[PDB]
Amino acid sequence: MIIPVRCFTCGKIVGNKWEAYLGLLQAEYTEGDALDALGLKRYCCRRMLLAHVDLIEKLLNYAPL
Amino acid sequence: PHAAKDSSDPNELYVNHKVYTRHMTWIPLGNQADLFPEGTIRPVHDDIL
Amino acid sequence: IDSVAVLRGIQKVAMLVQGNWVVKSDILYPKDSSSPHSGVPAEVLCRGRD
Numbered sequence A: 001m002i003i004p005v006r007c008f009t010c011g012k013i014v015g016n017k018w019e020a021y022l023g024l025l026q027a028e029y030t031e032g033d034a035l036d037a038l039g040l041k042r043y044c045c046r047r048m049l050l051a052h053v054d055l056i057e058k059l060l061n062y063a064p065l
Numbered sequence B: 001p002h003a004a005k006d007s008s009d010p011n012e013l014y015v016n017h018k019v020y021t022r023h024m025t026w027i028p029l030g031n032q033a034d035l036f037p038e039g040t041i042r043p044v045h046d047d048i049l
Numbered sequence C: 001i002d003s004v005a006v007l008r009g010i011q012k013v014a015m016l017v018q019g020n021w022v023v024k025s026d027i028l029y030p031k032d033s034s035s036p037h038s039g040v041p042a043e044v045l046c047r048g049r050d
């Protein structure tokens, strides 16, 4: 639904980097170099950010509004 | 109130559409406003969505 | 089929881009159609594609 704030394994703050990762995607940066520049050395945060699906907008498209 | 005709991007279509942690306002209790100076009690990253 | 006929047929539904032919935007997006992802009118999509 929405990017979690904390990582499951370690607990590093990752929710604040979701918009930055989306910006890097809109840019020419690839997944690997984008996650490397975001400062995620360990693979847990890389997986957290890469395997995450963005459904909040898909649900808001159905929200009452 | 002021946006483009299409405004396909939510950033331009709506305002405050992403509730970041920076919107949190610390409400002092008793003498906490005098004990802690302004700007100390705040979210750490200030950018958590 | 005649080359002049093919040219007259393609000049009405395509444009020249770096020697290649690209279909016009209105042919892909009719006036009654809309964006399948955002729902914006077809005129805006045509302007963006142009």
Ligand SMILES: [Zn+2]
Pocket: A007, A008, A009, A010, A011, A012, A044, A045, A046, A048
């Ligand atoms: Zn992690």
